[model samples]
Structure formats: structure tokens, C-alpha cells
Target: YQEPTDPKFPQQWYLSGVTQRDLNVKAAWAQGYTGHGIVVSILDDGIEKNHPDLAGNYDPGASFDVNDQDPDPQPRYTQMNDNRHGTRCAGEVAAVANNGVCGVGVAYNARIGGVRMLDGEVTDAVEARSLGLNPNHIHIYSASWGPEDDGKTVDGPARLAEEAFFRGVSQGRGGLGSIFVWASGNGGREHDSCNCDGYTNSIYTLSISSATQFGNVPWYSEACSSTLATTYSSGNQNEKQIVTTDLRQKCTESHTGTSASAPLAAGIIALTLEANKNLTWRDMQHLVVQTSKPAHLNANDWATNGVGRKVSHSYGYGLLDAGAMVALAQNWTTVAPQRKCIIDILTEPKDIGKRLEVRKTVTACLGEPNHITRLEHAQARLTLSYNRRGDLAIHLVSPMGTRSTLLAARPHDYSADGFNDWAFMTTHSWDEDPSGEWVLEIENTSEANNYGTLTKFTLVLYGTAS
Candidate 1:
């Protein structure tokens, strides 16, 4: 029933829930949670801070142009629309409400900014600067780009960038930790797996996928166990795309891909944070897992996890419910400190094929200080080489019999490089017990000439001891 006076608000089906498949953002807004004090910065090409719909809510303190070593994060003008990405993303997070211009944002009162780092030379130093920018003043960092997502490239943060992530999660937001929202790759047509991209697979990030307006998975979404939740975005040419601010001080209804989904998730998280400022980064992740709804989303791979939580590699826990997340955050209790237990099972190489199956059992540090009774995130650090990397599919079965598809076969990935100590993370085992037998199943799903060797296998378990 909540309504905005903005002219384009009626076209924002994702917020109005006209088809009963949209996110319940109106419910959260009814409770007066509009992300009043949250700061979300887009790490993309740049943003048009002077846009009519964004000027009032723009936070200069959260923005910087690392490309020019300046304070302004304005986009480089172009007729090709190359730098329009950041401005559109910012609008999704915090376009001015009742502006009589473009549509309202998911968190209309949140302060939005942008980092102009993607327009120039992108290196480890540049990524570090963008990710670690104003960590205390910027509550959330929304990023929509990652590796090429070509189904062949396997890459992630370098040394400096990795340090930046650690620092952000360890010391940002006055020790509550900064929230990092990332878009799961839009490489479904290329048969790319999000697990192959280390940024989306990182435990520090909350990877978000996209669902079409009709409650179906978007055609361009990349499926993987690491994705935490889903949001509404573009699908087919006939499907409705996201409406937001564009370059040249204009509005656009053509913003597409997972790029549009991540900012929406960030805005929702901003609302949740406004409801409860004490929530840590880990708490936010738990809240999303607990509040996301899976009832309407249609995906055949949906399965009940060990803890009876319905999850899918394509949609994670399911479409995000803004109202539920805010409601839960109001009185949410902080989770226990995270504990890490890394078990190295294999250091020597072993052959893997269609007929070969690898299995390992774990006590989950039963009696040690790092003992984990419940699971949060599980990482399979692997070092494997294959003739054709795309021919392989990997799965992990938890002690409670919850099977998680860690990585699916990508037919278009013809790379022979394979994976070298790559960390494939998953949230499918969230809140599951970590004790007993765990199976690591790998298969060459193709009849083509393919072979591989598992040189190293390590299971890194993160959860609470209590």
C-alpha cells in the first residue's frame, strides 16, 4: 500500500509486487525503514552525482576517483554509453524519493556514491583502493563487475586486493565490518560457473543472482553454490528491465544483467542495516539466508539442505524479501565469533575420471578451540589439472546428507589450464552440522577426450563453536 509520488514509480514492478512475484520492499518501507543513515558506494566506471534523482542523497565523502586521484567520482563523458554503468547502479541504491523524475530506489534515503576506478588502468593497486575506500564512512560496497566471465578465465584478487578485503571485513564500519555486495556473473549463455570467478566465490562477499520479472531465473544468470540470494533483473528481450537513472541527467528502463541486481541487494541490506546498525557482516549474511523466500522462484535444482533450508545453485536461498530481512534485523542477536578449521586431506596428486570418486570424512575439529558445531561457509581449495576444464562437475555432500553442487560443467570452457589452488566456496551448507562423513565427488561429465589430476584437496570450514 505504500506509494511514492514519483512519476516512474508505477513502472517499478519489482518494488510494487504487482505480479505477486516481486520483492516485498513496500512492506519494509511501510515500517519507515528507508536506509536513512547508510552509505553505499558503487565500485564501477563512475557516477553522475549531479543527476536530479541522486544529487540530494549523494555523499561526497564516500566517493573518490582513483583514476584521476581526485575527490569527484564523475564518469568520463561518452556517446557510446560506456560509463553509464555506475550511475544506473547508484540510482538502484538511492534515487531521491518523490522526485517527480525517475523511479524511487530500493533504499531511497540511503547515501550513495561511486568510485571512478574502472575507467582507467585496473590493477591490484586500483582494486585495493576501490574496495577499501572510506571503509568507515562507506557502510556497503556494491560491485557489478568481475573477471571476464568467458567460461575460461579463472582469476580473483591479487595480493594487495586480498589484503584490502581482509582489512575491510576486519576493521571497517567501526569494527562491525563493511558489507560487500557482488553480482554473480551473467554468463549463462557462455556456460560459465560463478565458482570459477574468485570474487563471487570469496567468503567476504555476498554474491547475488538475478530472477526475471516472472519469478523465473534470468537467462543470463550464472549458477553456483556461492550465491547468497536472488533479486529481480532483466531476462529475455520481452521481459521488463530495471528502471533507474542513466547518464546525461536522464532516466533509463534498459539497465540490464546482474549489474542491476547487486545494487538492489545492497539497497535492501542498507534498509536492514538502518533497522539495526549493530549487525556485523556475518550477521547480515545469516539474516539473508534466514529471510530470503524460495516459494515463488522456479528452479528444478532446488533442494533442502542439511538443516532443512531450501536452496538452489541458481538462486541460493531464493529471492530476497526486503521486509523479512528488515523485520528480522530489528531484534536480531549477534552471532558468535567465527571459527576456522582447515583440514588438508590430499597433498599428492591423484587421477580423476568419470569412474573415480573422492571421499573424505571430518570431525570438524571436534575437541579443539576451532571446533565448529554449525557451518556457515565451506571452501574446497583445489589444485587440479585437466585436458578440458569444462568437462568436470564437482559436488559436496555434507554430514547430514545435504548435497551441494559446488561447480557445474561449462560446455563453452575449453581451457586446458584447469584450477591451480582455487577456492570454491559454498553457502549451501549454512547452519548445517559439520561432524561426520563428507564426500567430495568429481566427475568428467563428457565423453570427449578429458582427464584430470587432483593434486591438492583442502576443506576449509568456517562456523561457530557454540
Candidate 2:
């Protein structure tokens, strides 16, 4: 393996952790999968395109200033350096190796760009334009910001933004689909659940969480069943943060949160894509499930699914191993076309008192073309109204008895605005059979008076038929 000459490479503990818990990117790099041709776009404030560590791999074709309607995506100047987020994230993916700069990126040879949209008004049209920018050219879009993690806000893509996601997956990348990597929320201190954040719950995006340098959970990490995988990031003050190019053509070792985690995952996926350009969006997800390792990541909520796969609400499927993913991608065959089955469990409004339990036996479209033997994602669509949304906790149990906590009670979420046809998703039941009795449990843990009714309940299962 060719060792990097960057001075700060020694400080990047996440690249090779003390407990051997770091991403195994060196193994993939030794095999010549250095993300040579992949282009990753950072959808954030903007980027420092002229930075010494990033200039070698910067791609103007993958960048745009949506805030100014220009081609350049340079960040607007500020004394506080508030807009340095995009530059820091971009460095995590494509900072050139051995440049006598700060540190080496995970995919040091990949091309990087930025979208300056977050600094302006983030309307539906603005988000749509940012998401649809050069979908055919940009292989992956790394998003670090989402709806506020305040525990009270429940928001996702609007009408036009939703269509952008559908278009990306249905037609982008020569029909292979564009990869959207998203950061799971950092609301752990507020007791906020990522399930409440619509972006993380969406099926189109690959939600990523974080593990500290010492293989422990970060203080700001949000736990939810929607998180698919995790990467290393900063934790407590004593713990070391990420090292990368910063704003003002500088370098920093203080990038923190899941914002730092998603770009690292994007870079690793770039290496996997370079190993096999034919793998579809769904195929990538399958590879992540098969190759991600649970070792070194310490979490008390880890559970083995029905198919004998370990998963956790905090770190789904465990830490990402770039070496294993690239090796699997090298010999990977494209997965079968995706099949979806939608089932309506309730049409009439039902009273949800202190406790509610609903059970439905499903055949998984037995004897039909859409029959699913193994599952990929399960979404529960619900239309409910309640007095206090924070007091509610929702759980789903698969036919194989693998239970997933879809939504945990958030003490800070006191909004009266309940869910309206919201789709709550989970990957905890991956590879489990879709046929059998499925049970949903809703509990109201509030000691005060809180009334609610479930107006509608539907289940949508996505997978392949055997």
C-alpha cells in the first residue's frame, strides 16, 4: 500500500483507530479502487474550490450556486466562518493525498463539488433544483442538513422536492439511480428521534449515523430504526474530531457531528462504485447490509434480527467497512428489479387511548409476481391526530418476531401537529420474510391528558421476489 505524505494523516484517527475500529479504506486503495472516476456533490452552504488540498480533485461540472443562480459554488464570506461546513465535508471525501496539506480523504482520488443552497431561503423549488442538479453526471449527493433537530419540527421534502427524489432514483445515472447519502439528525441531547425527521425516514436516501473515535456513541447522535449504517465522527470534548481542509483555504481538526459522518460514508461508497460501476442503487444498499461489520462499535441496544443479522437503533447494521464493500462490489451482480406491495390495514379512524395494538396477517402477495421472500425496507404510513405528539411511542414487529422501535417518545416535542399520512420507515427487518402476522403497538406514555386517533394505517413493503 502507498502511504500518504500528508502531515495530518497521522492525526486522522478515524482512518485507522486505536482499537482497530476505523474504516478499512487502505485495503481498497491497495487494490486500485481509489474512487478515480466518481464524482460526489456536497449539498450544503458551499465549498472552497481553490483550497490547496482540494483543488486537484475539484470538478466544476458537479458544482452550482443555487443561492446566487451562478455556476460557482464558493461560500459567501463571513467573519464567524459559519459557512465552512461544505468545505470541511468536501475535504472528507476528496482532499488530494500526499499534497503536503492537512489530511487525506477517504476517497482521495475522487472528484468533489458543492451546491450553495443552504445559505439562502430553502423553499421547495430551491431544494428541488439542488437535488436535481446534474443528476446524470454526479454519482452521489451528500446532504448533511435536514429539518431542524429541535424535536418539535416534523418536515421533509415538499411537492417539487419529492418529485426530484423520485426522478433521481427512476431516471438518473443512466437508470442505475443516483445515490443520496444523508446525515441522521444530531438531536440526542434533546431526546429527539430521527424517525421524526422526514429526510432520514425517506426510502430514497441512505441514512447514516456516527461512532466516536473510540468506538462509542457520540453525545449528539440521534437514534432511530431508519439509520442504515454508521461512520466515525467526534464525540465528547476530550475525544478527537475530524481532520480536513477548512474555510479560508485553511485546515482544521474540529469537524464534528453526523455532518462529518455522511461525507465519509459517501467517499467509501465512491470506492465501492469505482470497483463496480454497474451496481444499482438497491445493489449498493444490499452490499452495505452484507458487508458492514458490528465489531468495535459499542451500543447497548443492539439486537439480532429474524435472519440472524445484528442491527441497532443507534448504529444500524454496524460500522461501514470500505475494504469489504469494495471486495463485494468487484464481483457483484445487479440485484433483481425492485417490487413493492402496498396493503391497507385500516381505513376508518380508530381511537388510540393509553395503549393500542393492531395485528394483520399478510401473505406477502403469495402466488403473485410481487411476492417477497426477503425484505429490504418496510414503511408504515399513518394518518393520525393527537393532542401531544411527543408522548407517543410506536413499535412494529415483523413476522419473524424482530421488533423495531419506529418512534420513541421525545419529551421536547410538544407540538399539537400530529402526523398526516406520514411514512415511517425501518431497515431493521432486512432479509426477513414478508409473509406472516405483523403487529403494531402504539403507546401513550404521557401522564397528562393527551387524546389521539389513528385515522389510517397502511403498510408498504419493498423487496425482490424469489
> How much lDDT does each candidate structure score?
0.91, 0.91
Per-residue error for 44 in candidate 2, Å, reads 0.4
Off by over 4 Å in 1: none
**TM-score per candidate:** 0.98, 0.98
lDDT of model number 2: 0.91
Candidate 2 lDDT, 197-309, residue by residue in tens: 88889888999999987789888999999999999999888889999999998999999999999999999999999999988888889988999989978999989999899
Per-residue lDDT over 1-466 for candidate 1, one digit per residue giving the tens place of the 0 to 100 score = 3588898888888996566778899999999999999999999999999999999999998899999999999999987989999999999999999869989999999999999999999999999999999999999999977789787778898999889999999999999998999999988888889998888999999999999887788878999989999999998887788999999999999999998999999999999999999999999999999999898889999999888899999999999999999999999999999999999987467898664566788899988999998899999888888988888899888888888888798888788998888988989999998888888888889987678789888999999975
